[PDB]
Amino acid sequence: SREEVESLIQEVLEVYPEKARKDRNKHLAVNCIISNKKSQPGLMTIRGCAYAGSKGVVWGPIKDMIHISHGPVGCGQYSRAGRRNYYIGTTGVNAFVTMNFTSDFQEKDIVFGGDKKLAKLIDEVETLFPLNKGISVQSECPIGLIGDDIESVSKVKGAELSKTIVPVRCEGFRGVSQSLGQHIANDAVRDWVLGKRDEDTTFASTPYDVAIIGDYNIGGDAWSSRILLEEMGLRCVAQWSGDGSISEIELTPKVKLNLVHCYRSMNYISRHMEEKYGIPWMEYNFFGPTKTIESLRAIAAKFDESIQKKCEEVIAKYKPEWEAVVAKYRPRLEGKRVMLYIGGLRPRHVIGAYEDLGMEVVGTGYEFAHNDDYDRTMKEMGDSTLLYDDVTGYEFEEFVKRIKPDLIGSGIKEKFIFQKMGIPFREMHSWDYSGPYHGFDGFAIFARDMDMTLNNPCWKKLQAPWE
Amino acid sequence: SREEVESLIQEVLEVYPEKARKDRNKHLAVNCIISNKKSQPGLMTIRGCAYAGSKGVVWGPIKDMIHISHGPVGCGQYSRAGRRNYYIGTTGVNAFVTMNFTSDFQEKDIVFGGDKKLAKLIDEVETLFPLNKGISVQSECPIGLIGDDIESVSKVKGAELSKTIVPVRCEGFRGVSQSLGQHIANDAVRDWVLGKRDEDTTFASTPYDVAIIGDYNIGGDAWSSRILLEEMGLRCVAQWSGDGSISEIELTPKVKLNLVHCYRSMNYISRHMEEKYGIPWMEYNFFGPTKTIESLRAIAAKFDESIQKKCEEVIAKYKPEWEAVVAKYRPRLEGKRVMLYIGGLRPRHVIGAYEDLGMEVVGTGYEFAHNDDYDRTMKEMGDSTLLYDDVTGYEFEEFVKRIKPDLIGSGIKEKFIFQKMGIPFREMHSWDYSGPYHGFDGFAIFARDMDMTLNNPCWKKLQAPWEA
Amino acid sequence: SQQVDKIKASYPLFLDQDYKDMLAKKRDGFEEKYPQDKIDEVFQWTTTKEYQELNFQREALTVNPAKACQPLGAVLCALGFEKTMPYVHGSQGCVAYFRSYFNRHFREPVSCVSDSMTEDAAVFGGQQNMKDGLQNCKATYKPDMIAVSTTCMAEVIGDDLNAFINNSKKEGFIPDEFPVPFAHTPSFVGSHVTGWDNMFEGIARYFTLKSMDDKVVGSNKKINIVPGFETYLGNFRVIKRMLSEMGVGYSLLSDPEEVLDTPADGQFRMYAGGTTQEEMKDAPNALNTVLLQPWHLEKTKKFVEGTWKHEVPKLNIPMGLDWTDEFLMKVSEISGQPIPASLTKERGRLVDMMTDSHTWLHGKRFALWGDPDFVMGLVKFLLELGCEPVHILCHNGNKRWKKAVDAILAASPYGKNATVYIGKDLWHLRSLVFTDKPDFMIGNSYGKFIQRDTLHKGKEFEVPLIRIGFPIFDRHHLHRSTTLGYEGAMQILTTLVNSILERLDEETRGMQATDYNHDLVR
Amino acid sequence: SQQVDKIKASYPLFLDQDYKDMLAKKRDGFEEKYPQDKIDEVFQWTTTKEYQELNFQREALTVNPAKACQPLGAVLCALGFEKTMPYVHGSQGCVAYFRSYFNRHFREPVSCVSDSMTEDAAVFGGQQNMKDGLQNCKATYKPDMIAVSTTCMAEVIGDDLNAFINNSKKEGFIPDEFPVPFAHTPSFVGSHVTGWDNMFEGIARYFTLKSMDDKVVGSNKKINIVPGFETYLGNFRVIKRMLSEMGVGYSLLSDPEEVLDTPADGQFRMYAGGTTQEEMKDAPNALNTVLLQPWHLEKTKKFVEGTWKHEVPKLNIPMGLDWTDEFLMKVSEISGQPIPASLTKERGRLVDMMTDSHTWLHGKRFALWGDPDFVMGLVKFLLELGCEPVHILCHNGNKRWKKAVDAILAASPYGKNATVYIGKDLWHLRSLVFTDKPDFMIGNSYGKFIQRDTLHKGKEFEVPLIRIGFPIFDRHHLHRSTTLGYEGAMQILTTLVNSILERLDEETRGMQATDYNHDLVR
Ligand code: CFM
Ligand code: CFM
Ligand SMILES: [Ca+2]
Ligand SMILES: [Ca+2]
């Protein structure tokens, strides 16, 4: 239908002023496109900031560390327990993920600088939460603008207390999206944490050590990945960020292979661990049977025959289980058209799982992804399907209106818009408080969930029997 | 003022027809009155039936027995878990007080008789609740009117299954109030349960065996009594009805003394156990310090010096505790006037406890009590205070209107009337889901409850500031 | 003992050691209690599939009924009329029970009298009790109407209510055209809903039967609404609200919402509001009559169709989305009034709430009980939410009702695991929630004893109660809420979703055990 | 593993043995976790009086704040106006957070834009972002108004909003009299309530300041009602209802109840209802202006008293019995309208509910937090119910507020054990509910983490949460309820009494242990 799509893009864009029209035309394509620059002012971008990329996705999930949102009270509040990066711990005692530690800037701190307040905050953190294994200080916008040196404070205090204090200059004005904040967070781990055990040779490694890099355990996602990799004989030394401890991060230079799930947020440190430590890395996809199977086979191919045998045994165990899932739910979802919009991995990665339930993904797009993500997307998506980079509120509403999908999978700022339009909606960020969606057990929940929402009785009652 | 009261009674009674006026005049007195007959038709009597007196107060509380409200579905429903006669057990397995077992009469049972249905009901009870230690069958109105013989069914089935099945002909039409149902229930225990162990000599008694007779453990009331009596050295073999088992009832002929709390509901069987078994009995009152103390002393005087010593030790232990209660709450309740209306013991018995908190009871009255209860009341109440027997809805509303009391203590059918009038209210039946009110540490609960309701913030708020 | 600054009521006072030992001594010395190991054994047998089979073989024993008797209903019907004394010819114990039962549900005064028939009346009729009874009542409580029903005593000895009332007018005990409608309400036929129907039909006959030749259908341009046995103030109020929103002339026949909710302002109001006698006399002139709860209003339907010549619409109880729509649309075409934007919006807000909440509601299994129309409307709305109504109990349901509900279950994929049980009771249901455990129960307060029975087996087996019905005695002021309309559907949706989320928080509130799913946002 | 007919989500899936062992292997192999016995030791120390002393010595560290930042407020203020785009000059991450925060509370679309200031703007001002931003916004989303506020980035580098807006009108990016009110809302001064105030005062100045000589006080015969930061749909709706019941002409200035509750009917409505620009221009002609939440509307009070010359009544938030009375009586004498029988009755029904429920409410101890006016109205109403507000927390409270609440505590016997804490947070409150354990907490969803912390110590130490406030993220549709008026007092009374009775049933649901007090009637 390629000219309908070509003509659609053009029509939506006429409501704009001129430099908006030109820029957004570059960011809308029929399956090339340009990606990752700035958002156009006043157009209701779905994108967050560099702070969200650092505190919200990379640092925040690290369990036994205290993360300090250094700045005013806002950022720490809105991001308090918003993302479901699951963990095992005793919160407030040894684990701290769902708490909000903030320096709560007042006008005296803006005017004079917040570094003496940060120094005293670090001591207070130490007397009240003795069992923390480290501290991060996540900069909000003001910090960089008023010229604070949180690095000085981190070194002097870190030395004084013999504790790891990571300064992260992830100010929301920095970059164009959450993406730069991910980069800043990876470099923050590189410079202040990862190298700590380069001298230490006392970790007893094995030929099967691996680390899950870039699985943030949304709804248990990483736990459902790990079980499969470990049943296949491999040892998961580290889980990056989701339910991760600081000592696992410190131990990741000891593994034989790094398994990158989220490429956009973790490719940076993966490239660095292959440079400095020689550790090879690979991308995998644990969304749906097809992809979890090809991934399990490809990871096993990097090792010996005993891991390839265990791989085929694991595939055999779960094969009755996912075949029952497709037998139940694929009749119920066949030929339904899905339109997607998430951030930097999921727009591409979940397609496989939808196809295993006989669904067609007719449109997908990323908030903050780069071009190397869009080169990966091309292959996964079909012909004449719609691609959209940093879609505006207006645009997404207008595309759905025309294309008329059976399911929309996006974030919370999109959810209630489409449900009012009669389109079924599933959050593809928080999983709509469900999940895990990774692995085989995750496919059963995913499939249960697309079904419960797309074939719900409520959608047939959007119109009154009188109008 | 005795003439204000005299004139009040007369005024209220003018709204009546003639035979109502004459009869109700006889049932309203300034402290001489007639009691326990019939209620006058159409006048919104607060009284229940003979079924309530039997199933609701005497039988229902017996824990390890299944009580069958034999008749239509109504009675068993309305009385299901309405009275808080507390017990320890596993309900539906070995204990059954809060469940509703009924024969649920339909028109075929009315027309043909419900005795074959009762016989099959008893078998069903036995297959589904194996651990019951006995069964009562509480007759509702229809049973007596349609000429059923539940006694035949009880004997044949009781013999067939070697189980105690007590027939109780407590049909709501019988009698004039809940009172006859109590009597019918006492005679039902006499004829079918109490005599079972007259042959049996294997219970090892002691000189200090006693039984609490007529404490129905409302909110734990009996448990708060029993602890005190046993700290005083006495052994409580039985608790009648409240948290009572059938074997305790069967063992009561082995005690040395029967302690009657509720006289109106248990005097009948107490007189019978003194005739047949020689067991002396006495009335006591465990409402408030003064009365619990004179009671503990009087019960102890029936035994030796070691029980009188233990008595004085028990009095000494709880004396700091109740003195703190009066020190806290008596300043808060001094000189407040209480008007009461309950059934057959409490109108007289709680006065002591109110006086220990410096409260004056300016009016009291019984639903279903007899004249021997009103002879006991006379002494407890002050001069020119109002007495009322089987008070009508109209009358109680009109007396309160005039007398203007600070507290009204009555039942659930009265509660929301007086709260709308701005008068503080405490239920003196269910204790307003509080209690225990018996003993020393039930006095603590009593006292804070009268205070919380009488000096509650809501009472100052009944008139809108723009209505003044 | 007692600490005066921290006074303990029954709970937790009897948990103190000297009390705990005292009760242990009582049990051991005198109770001859069964061994605890045996009590456990028998408890575990009460939970089995084998026990459940023996439980449904009961023919004579009813345990824990989920219904009441006919005169209860007649009193609630009667309270709905202006300055009317409900009066129940027969035994006085009954009236003390009906008053108490309703007092505890509404937490309000419930005024109703008896004519106190004793044993003497059993052998010689209650005729003098009717004569004196009505005279005293008229004079002491000043009612504009007295609505007489009966207790079993008066029914078994066959007192002719009609004759007894006519002879008391003749002998001058009450004025000759003082309103005394009557109904024979036998406790042993049907239930409390049957008594509401009988009472209403009797009051309708009293103001109508002998004056029909004067009446033209549709002349007052109003629609009559007969509510049925209704124990939520919000259901009376919402029907009225919506009809007034539409600008539809109506007449709610039997309306107790004012008497059952008078203000605490220094005075007691025995009577308040209610349907006037003038609305009952002029009721044949309505365009039609809508029966809000038709499965317990069959006698009334035959009288309004047969004597008033109204064509009563085949409308279900207006519960849930589809049946509230169907209700408003029938009201729209009888009155010729369009459905206003406000109700079209309120419908949309309800559908919005449904779409926001469906992920937590989907596939949820319920055991539920109650009166016939309440149960089928709750079943319909649960099917609309995508929930499974697994155990449907209606003790006072009939065979035709059961077929109408199996038919609405058959039309939904969410009714495939559902079974409707009529004539069965709460001890029967205690077994179905053990052997085919649902997630929750929707029912009255008698269901709290089923919930503690399921917790005794263990936490995994506990089935929480969601209190919706009559009677609700252990919670305050839920008699004020709404189960009908869009309003009512919004309240039930919010209770169902939040009971579910509460239980999830409870199951995930354990530190380092289950709190990994103790989510801030749900 | 997974059984396809009974699919397990995160809970309870990770409780399966192969998962439980896997996590045990992770902890032991790689986490270098503290010994469990040490975690327990430190947990028990966090509950002590010694820890609490160290916790209140905090000067630099805020943990678990009970407030948000200024621009959040400005957005909610702005949504209340007709066809208005909230627009926050500065960083875009902010706007994604304010939208999400409100989306999860209301479960609705929250429309708001940013002009996406990057690093370039930090060194050269956000001037071009204002110019392009307003132009694109006007054209893409078609608003009749755009209300501009700021994020910290724009405040720290001192962008003159006024100049930036005037230069974008001059250069022709937006029409010269296209409405663009503004407010500088710095995240580091005050809180979200301060941003609501600043925004309102800015919109009031935009329609008023330069046109006062034309205005006569009292000429439109209306009273203006400024709501404040309000996140309950029922509070907007009840103020309106009562004023209309009185037949009082009013103008609710900032009214978001339609946009925050549009129907699901096949179409998305970006805009809906709201206060028109005509009501804002004609607002000086009102008899007076009532501030519903005065402690966070101080700037607004000075502008309405100083420029509009209105004599703003000294009225507290209309919460509880006394302050709703005081509100209706002020409205009665400003408008000269009498209080109708309907509100006098509703007041009486509330007092009736109070008398029916006082036995369960009396002496009940609460820890509570929230915004200043919400907290003092909840404290007043708890004192009226005979409850003790033991721990009063208001992170964004000021010294004068604290003195006004200590004064209302001093006048009641139920405020003798109460302490008001300003500038303190939820980690501070976590200690007060351990060392001076209340019965319940009334607060937002962040309080669920305090409840699981108290359960970890043990069941006897558990303090249940009662969700009343903002944000409520873990329950559905409670944003629809009411805390103001008699209606609001009836809803809080019913929640407080039933939470109490629920907890009593929970504590007495144990067979042969504590169920002797598992009463049918309470
Ligand atoms: S929007 Fe993932 S690159 Fe990042 S929070 Fe979601 S599509 Fe993020 S997969 Fe991940 S767990 Fe994410 S869902 Fe990469 S971590 S900045 Mo919003
Ligand atoms: S109204 Fe007792 S003679 Fe009987 S239920 Fe209450 S004043 Fe009864 S003391 Fe007792 S526990 Fe009673 S309170 Fe005699 S048992 S028929 Mo209603
Ligand atoms: Ca009431
Ligand atoms: Ca919504």
CSV table of N, CA, C and O and ligand atoms in Angstrom, one decimal, chain B residues 416-417 419-420, chain C residues 103 106-109 260-264 477 479-480, chain D residues 348-349 351-357, ligand 3:
chain,number,residue,atom,x,y,z
B,416,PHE,N,-30.8,4.2,67.8
B,416,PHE,CA,-30.7,5.3,66.8
B,416,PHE,C,-31.8,6.4,67.0
B,416,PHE,O,-31.7,7.5,66.4
B,417,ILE,N,-32.9,6.1,67.7
B,417,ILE,CA,-33.9,7.0,68.1
B,417,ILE,C,-33.3,8.1,68.9
B,417,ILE,O,-33.4,9.3,68.5
B,419,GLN,N,-30.1,8.8,69.7
B,419,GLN,CA,-29.0,9.5,69.1
B,419,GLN,C,-29.4,10.6,68.2
B,419,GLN,O,-28.7,11.7,68.1
B,420,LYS,N,-30.5,10.5,67.5
B,420,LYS,CA,-31.1,11.5,66.7
B,420,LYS,C,-31.7,12.7,67.5
B,420,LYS,O,-31.7,13.8,67.1
C,103,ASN,N,-32.5,-2.5,61.6
C,103,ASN,CA,-31.8,-1.5,62.4
C,103,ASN,C,-30.3,-1.7,62.2
C,103,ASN,O,-29.6,-0.7,61.9
C,106,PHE,N,-29.2,-0.7,58.3
C,106,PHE,CA,-29.3,0.7,58.0
C,106,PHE,C,-28.7,1.7,59.0
C,106,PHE,O,-28.4,2.9,58.8
C,107,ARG,N,-28.5,1.1,60.2
C,107,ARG,CA,-28.1,1.8,61.5
C,107,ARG,C,-29.1,3.0,61.6
C,107,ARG,O,-28.7,4.1,61.8
C,108,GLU,N,-30.4,2.7,61.6
C,108,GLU,CA,-31.4,3.8,61.7
C,108,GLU,C,-32.6,3.2,62.5
C,108,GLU,O,-32.7,2.0,62.7
C,109,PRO,N,-33.5,4.0,63.0
C,109,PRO,CA,-34.8,3.5,63.5
C,109,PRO,C,-35.6,2.9,62.5
C,109,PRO,O,-35.7,3.3,61.3
C,260,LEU,N,-35.4,6.0,56.0
C,260,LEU,CA,-34.2,5.2,56.3
C,260,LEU,C,-32.9,6.0,56.3
C,260,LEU,O,-31.8,5.5,56.3
C,261,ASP,N,-33.0,7.4,56.3
C,261,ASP,CA,-31.8,8.3,56.4
C,261,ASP,C,-32.2,9.6,56.9
C,261,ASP,O,-31.9,10.7,56.4
C,262,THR,N,-32.9,9.7,58.1
C,262,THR,CA,-33.3,11.0,58.6
C,262,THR,C,-32.0,11.6,59.3
C,262,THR,O,-31.2,10.9,59.9
C,263,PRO,N,-31.9,12.9,59.3
C,263,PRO,CA,-30.8,13.7,60.0
C,263,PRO,C,-30.8,13.7,61.5
C,263,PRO,O,-31.9,13.7,62.1
C,264,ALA,N,-29.6,13.6,62.1
C,264,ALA,CA,-29.5,13.8,63.6
C,264,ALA,C,-29.4,15.2,63.9
C,264,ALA,O,-28.3,15.8,63.9
C,477,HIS,N,-22.0,2.0,57.2
C,477,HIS,CA,-22.5,2.9,56.2
C,477,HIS,C,-22.5,2.5,54.7
C,477,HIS,O,-22.7,3.3,53.8
C,479,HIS,N,-24.7,0.8,53.4
C,479,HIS,CA,-26.1,0.8,52.9
C,479,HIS,C,-26.4,2.1,52.1
C,479,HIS,O,-27.4,2.2,51.5
C,480,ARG,N,-25.5,3.0,52.2
C,480,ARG,CA,-25.6,4.3,51.4
C,480,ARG,C,-25.1,4.2,50.0
C,480,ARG,O,-25.3,5.1,49.2
D,348,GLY,N,-27.0,17.2,58.6
D,348,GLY,CA,-27.6,16.4,59.6
D,348,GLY,C,-27.3,14.9,59.4
D,348,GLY,O,-27.2,14.1,60.4
D,349,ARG,N,-27.2,14.4,58.2
D,349,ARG,CA,-27.0,13.1,57.8
D,349,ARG,C,-25.5,12.8,58.2
D,349,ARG,O,-25.2,11.7,58.7
D,351,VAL,N,-23.8,14.3,60.6
D,351,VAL,CA,-23.8,14.3,62.1
D,351,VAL,C,-24.4,13.0,62.5
D,351,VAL,O,-23.9,12.4,63.5
D,352,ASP,N,-25.4,12.4,61.8
D,352,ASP,CA,-26.0,11.2,62.1
D,352,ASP,C,-24.9,10.0,61.9
D,352,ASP,O,-24.8,9.1,62.8
D,353,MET,N,-24.2,10.1,60.9
D,353,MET,CA,-23.1,9.1,60.6
D,353,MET,C,-22.1,9.2,61.7
D,353,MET,O,-21.6,8.1,62.1
D,354,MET,N,-21.8,10.4,62.2
D,354,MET,CA,-20.8,10.6,63.2
D,354,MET,C,-21.2,9.9,64.5
D,354,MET,O,-20.4,9.3,65.2
D,355,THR,N,-22.5,10.0,64.8
D,355,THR,CA,-23.1,9.4,66.1
D,355,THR,C,-23.2,7.9,66.0
D,355,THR,O,-23.1,7.2,67.0
D,356,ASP,N,-23.4,7.4,64.7
D,356,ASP,CA,-23.5,6.0,64.5
D,356,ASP,C,-22.1,5.3,64.6
D,356,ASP,O,-22.0,4.1,65.0
D,357,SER,N,-21.1,6.0,64.2
D,357,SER,CA,-19.8,5.5,64.2
D,357,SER,C,-18.7,5.8,65.3
D,357,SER,O,-17.7,5.2,65.3
E,3,CA,CA,-28.2,6.4,61.4
